[PDB]
Design a binder for this molecule. Structure first.
Ligand SMILES: O=C(NCc1ccccc1)c1cc(Cl)cc(C(=O)Nc2ccccc2)c1
Lengths: 11, 259
């Protein structure tokens, strides 16, 4: 959940 | 003794770069927050939720579906935290050396830092009476949040407790930008692959933070040490927070997760 958002935001 | 040399100049340019990036990533700064909370602004005066009646009017006239007030409030809080994760990630990308780290390490730092930085940025939005919400359109009193039924009544209390003592240190946006960067580059997060490069960036951020606090706070010669003690406090505080987020999850039942 948290990882999902961080990863997409990091793009 | 302290000298204005090429090294101190580079730490000041790093401090300024983080401030600039901070101002960019976080729409509502502590300076603007303190202006709203102290009525030292021309900007629109926020709507005060101090009881159930003022909440009901507030929902209709804040302009941000469970039939429980307490659940609707907590959902707004969790939606704002997703948004805060995105703002903090965007900020993390501006820290020199951070986008150069193993992506998996970038994720781990953010995964374990965001909650600690959310407590920090919440203090900027709080005074003894309550917390600014809805990017400063609303203000919700500490005692009203505390009156919500179990287990929602105790959700915000530890953030207020942290904020009362953290705010007493009178940090500004220039101090906070570096403070938050020191938190993100914590070499001791579980599951990191390549620790040394994180400690190397952190060492530089710690030197920048120490200089910022000496130049900016002639009233406390050990403010640097006191801030490191807060990063230590924040660790166990987030432990308790994550603990309660569970008790809720398994006792009570955001569009970017659905996508
Ligand atoms: O808008 C909120 N709740 C929705 C609502 C309000 C009033 C009536 C009905 C529904 C809300 C409530 C609380 Cl207690 C805190 C926050 C908030 O901004 N949290 C936050 C998290 C991370 C970083 C900064 C702030 C937002």
């Amino acid at each position: 959940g948290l990882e999902a958002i961080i990863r997409k935001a990091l793009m | 003794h302290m000298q204005l040399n090429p090294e101190s100049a580079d730490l000041r340019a790093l401090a300024k770069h983080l401030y600039d990036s901070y101002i960019k990533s976080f729409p509502l700064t502590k300076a603007k927050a303190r202006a709203i909370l102290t009525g030292k602004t021309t900007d629109k005066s926020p709507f005060v939720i101090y009881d159930m009646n003022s909440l009901m009017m507030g929902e209709d006239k804040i302009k941000f579906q469970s039939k429980e007030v307490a659940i609707r409030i907590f959902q707004g809080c969790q939606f704002r935290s997703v948004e805060a994760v995105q703002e903090i990630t965007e900020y993390a990308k501006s820290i020199p050396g951070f986008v150069n780290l193993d992506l998996n390490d970038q994720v781990t730092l953010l995964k374990y830092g965001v909650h600690e930085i959310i407590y920090t940025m919440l203090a900027s939005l709080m005074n003894k009476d309550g917390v600014l919400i809805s990017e400063g359109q609303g203000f919700m009193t500490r005692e009203f949040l505390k009156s919500l039924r179990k287990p929602f009544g105790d959700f915000m209390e530890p953030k207020f407790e942290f904020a009362v003592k953290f705010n007493a240190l009178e940090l500004d946006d220039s101090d906070l930008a570096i403070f938050i960067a020191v938190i993100i580059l914590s070499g001791d997060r579980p599951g990191l692959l390549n620790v040394k490069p994180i400690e190397d960036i952190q060492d530089n951020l710690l030197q920048a933070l120490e200089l910022q606090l000496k130049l900016n706070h002639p009233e406390s010669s050990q403010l640097f040490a006191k801030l490191l003690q807060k990063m230590t406090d924040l660790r166990q505080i987030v432990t308790e927070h994550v603990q309660l987020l569970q008790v809720i999850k398994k006792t009570e039942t955001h569009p970017l997760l659905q996508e």
